[PDB]
């Protein structure tokens, strides 16, 4: 007997002896849940590490050309004491208008000599065609003058020429948390 | 075996996929910049080995796993496939027999030559070639191929050289 | 209290009694890793079983027609002592030129009377449209004169007519390992 | 009778071809740093003791010398502040910058040229110079790149 | 004040007579490997640190030098990439290739000549050069050959 092997009246049964047959391991069923917008995951930063983010408005891009923009930080972390601060894993993603002309991509590498050449070498690349319009520079830039980054632009290409402020781009960046966040200021100056 | 209520998490470009290297076996890579390719034809470059490991000392080394991915301008002209085989007599013949092959229509445009070359002289590679084909013709430097290989550490980074002979 | 149920000052809380509600079992998250070319899997053969492989160059195929080719083994295993050898699971896959005309498929069955008819009956089928251009004849041909196979051709169809040597095809085949592999030869002949 | 590097320290070397020069005058050349380490990432690494030596054609002019110092305003004056110097007249055509730079941004040196003087004017690619530099080995060193790009 | 070899390492040496040369020019010579080790068997052996020095007639021209590198396309350029060099002007007329080749096919070197330059042109067999090379001792070393042939 085995599965629902419960009937009525007699009914013998025999099998055969050999070297088994079925697969060695057995099955497990599953059910991929359908996820909606934003349900994703915004992994938390790490130890004593802050994640400073902010965006930069786009520049009128052309046909199939690709522009660049030395990225600069905000006044807060723009302190010589914080400039020489260390960074962690970091990502870039981009918010853009709904009515978009063609599909396009974007990345970031050391102040490239050749602007288009960037895409031939960057670790990750925010692609529009992809479901995830963003790139993860995990350990890619871990450790670096929180100023170093300045000399190092970001690259963006477009299939169809396009306007400026036509799209922003955020940069969630891991970096050691400063000390300002806490304590006030010396009353005695 | 009750079903497992699971949930595929979204993967964003350059995420995870950390690729640990083997012990003692150090991985070193670089790249050769494409030379203009015609439409549908497939070029091939001998192994653009780096001088860093040209010394017969290390050139007489061995390998194992070997990656190969590529960077192409956003203005990528259609699609292209790439790979590597034994100084293939026929150019296109290489694609008819490599263990792996990076393609532009693949989520991950790269090829993993898993052990397929394990135990081969580091020099043993130069008698190899890298083959790349393109849908429509295209320029040179238009694409870069990245030979990511692992092998071993020698006896030099270890130290400098003769002060006074 | 439960999740982050740590606040300030008082703030009571009560629920309701019924017949529960939520699903019976609970969730598990995952992350499908992105695999590249060749990372796949080349399952190892089995006990005392060798996997002899080799390829056969193509024949100029026509429009939508499908050719065939009595497959023959290599001299080594072409011994009457090894001819009457047993086989295991076996697969066929194919390497072909990059610049390909249309998509096409291929399989293998007993020296078919009708060449096209093969595709209506073979266990597996190397399809080009598929991500896996190969077929697995697991147990499909397990057990058989390592010669039997001879009488039994292989079939290939093409959407667009095409040249010869236009493509090869390998046959990784499981079969009992012979004895030559080891010991040398009787010095005394 | 050999030599050794340091703990967790790599010695990256390479050469730079000479640009022809005039006699008695001394040229300079910002550093041709190796791309592999041009990443602000490791470009901001720690260096150790470092040395420079030079291979040059046999058939070469009068005995000349060469060193390295901060982006020196005076090409010739760089030899008065040089820590060590590769002299041709010496039996040792090289200079040891031990602990002279021990502990500095791998990208620091960039803002710091190399100086070479010559008795008789001389051709380009007429002589090379190698730079055996101690620096902490970085990360990736032993693990591939995420295929997912 | 002496020197030592390595563990299970033999130091096979021998010399090669110079072929007359022209002044200022520099010749080359693939390696005259010793037959005893020309057997692909040990020819595929591991080498260690190795040195070259040179005995030459007393009565000899202007101070000249010599080294060794991969089959160099440019005879003269081999001296810019040379690891160490035997200079005559130096008190040490020899070059130490310690760990420079440490670990290489005993048959590798073959595809690698030796370079020599001279101030004044000079005769053949006018100077020899010895090669003290570290390499793992092979097998037979201590046992006869089967008489049964
Ligand atoms: Mg700094
Ligand atoms: Mg039979
Ligand atoms: Mg003196």
Swiss-Prot record, chains A, C:
The UniProt entry lists the main location of this chain as virion
Q: Highest taxon of the source?
A: Viruses
Q: Report biased composition (Basic residues) as residue ranges.
A: 11-21
Q: What's the short name of a Pfam family annotated to this entry?
A: Bromo_coat
- Establish whether keyword Signal is in the entry: no
A Gene Ontology molecular function term of the record: RNA binding
Which family is it part of?
Answer: Belongs to the bromovirus capsid protein family.
Name the UniProt record assigns to this protein:
Capsid protein
Q: Which organism is it from?
A: Brome mosaic virus
Q: List the lineage, top down.
A: Viruses, Riboviria, Orthornavirae, Kitrinoviricota, Alsuviricetes
Curated annotation (Swiss-Prot), chains D, E:
What domain of life? Answer: Viruses
Query: What is the name of this protein?
Result: Capsid protein
> Which portion of the complete protein is shown here?
41 to 189 of 189
Its Gene Ontology cellular component terms are: host cell endoplasmic reticulum; ribonucleoprotein complex; T=3 icosahedral viral capsid; viral nucleocapsid
Q: Which family does it belong to?
A: Belongs to the bromovirus capsid protein family.
Q: Which organism is it from?
A: Brome mosaic virus (BMV)
Q: What keywords appear on the UniProt entry?
A: Capsid protein, Ribonucleoprotein, RNA-binding, T=3 icosahedral capsid protein, Viral nucleoprotein, Virion
Which terms in the Gene Ontology molecular function aspect does this entry carry? RNA binding; structural molecule activity
Task: Relay the domain remarks.
Answer: The N-terminal arginine-rich region binds selectively to subgenomic RNA4.
* Function summary: Capsid protein. Binds specifically to the subgenomic RNA4 to ensure selective packaging.
State its location(s). Answer: Virion
Coiled coil ranges: none
Its predominant location is virion
């Amino acid at each position: 007997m085995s599965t629902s092997g419960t009937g009525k009246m007699t009914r013998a049964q025999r099998r055969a002896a050999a070297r088994r047959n079925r697969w060695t391991a057995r099955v497990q069923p599953v059910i991929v849940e359908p996820l909606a917008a934003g349900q994703g995951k915004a992994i938390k930063a790490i130890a004593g590490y802050s994640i400073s983010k902010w965006e930069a408005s786009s520049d009128a891009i052309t046909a199939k050309a690709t522009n660049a923009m030395s990225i600069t930080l905000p006044h807060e972390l723009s302190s010589e004491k914080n400039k020489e601060l260390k960074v962690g894993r970091v990502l870039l993603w981009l918010g853009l208008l709904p009515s978009v002309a063609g599909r396009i991509k974007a990345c970031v590498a050391e102040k490239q000599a050749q602007a288009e050449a960037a895409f031939q070498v960057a670790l990750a690349v925010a692609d529009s065609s992809k479901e995830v319009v963003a790139a993860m520079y995990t350990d890619a830039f871990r450790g670096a003058t929180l100023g170093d980054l300045l000399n190092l632009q970001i690259y963006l290409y477009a299939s169809e020429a396009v306007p400026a402020k036509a799209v922003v781009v955020h940069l969630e960046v891991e970096h050691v948390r400063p000390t300002f966040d806490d304590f006030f200021t010396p009353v005695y100056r």
